[PDB]
Amino acid sequence: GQELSQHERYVEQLKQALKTRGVKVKYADLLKFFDFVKDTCPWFPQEGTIDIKRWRRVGDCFQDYYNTFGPEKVPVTAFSYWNLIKELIDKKEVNPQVMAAVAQTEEILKSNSQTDLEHHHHHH
């Protein structure tokens, strides 16, 4: 939704918080970096949050196909992204996306309809 503003910040921020690691931020970077994730939007196409598990999926999927092209350049800077993002989530001040993201884990017995044990139960 309107939260889209988050991306605008993430792009400028993440890139900034990156330069600190010794990285560079060029316009050509937005075209590729933006088009890269946008491809499969691994950041959760629903909430658009950060995901470590999914991140690996896109990482191996891109690295695998990219490798087939026997690339010599193989930019290592990508290593910094994983390291930064890895700890980036640790932040609790993450946009509300936290509540919409938590969707990752849900009570298997939230309702009676659930096959598992009902939400309400009694025991001696």
Side-chain angles (χ1 to χ4, degrees):
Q2 287 179 309
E3 292 179 3
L4 188 67
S5 59
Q6 286 179 45
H7 282 262
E8 183 176 347
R9 303 172 66 199
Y10 175 87
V11 165
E12 298 295 339
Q13 188 66 36
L14 207 307
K15 286 185 172 210
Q16 277 170 43
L18 254 173
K19 185 179 180 179
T20 202
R21 275 185 65 83
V23 191
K24 294 180 181 178
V25 307
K26 205 211 300 190
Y27 293 85
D29 196 350
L30 280 90
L31 311 181
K32 185 180 180 179
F33 182 73
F34 202 109
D35 292 343
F36 254 49
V37 281
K38 184 176 181 308
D39 181 357
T40 47
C41 33
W43 257 248
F44 224 131
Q46 297 180 6
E47 173 55 31
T49 184
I50 328 190
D51 288 348
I52 308 303
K53 306 290 191 188
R54 237 177 179 87
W55 167 239
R56 293 183 296 173
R57 185 179 182 276
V58 53
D60 55 53
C61 291
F62 273 57
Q63 198 72 46
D64 177 1
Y65 268 92
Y66 183 64
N67 284 180
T68 60
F69 287 102
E72 281 176 354
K73 317 309 197 182
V74 178
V76 176
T77 67
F79 194 67
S80 293
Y81 265 90
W82 168 67
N83 287 340
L84 183 63
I85 266 150
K86 165 169 181 179
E87 94 82 42
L88 192 68
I89 292 185
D90 91 324
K91 289 182 180 181
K92 295 178 180 180
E93 297 294 341
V94 185
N95 249 238
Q97 86 199 42
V98 177
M99 296 292 293
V102 164
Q104 292 177 1
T105 302
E106 293 177 5
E107 291 176 1
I108 57 172
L109 42 76
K110 46 178 182 180
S111 293
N112 176 303
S113 59
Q114 295 291 309
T115 316
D116 292 354
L117 279 60
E118 296 178 1
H119 187 80
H120 293 101
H121 58 284
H122 287 267
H123 190 67
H124 184 77

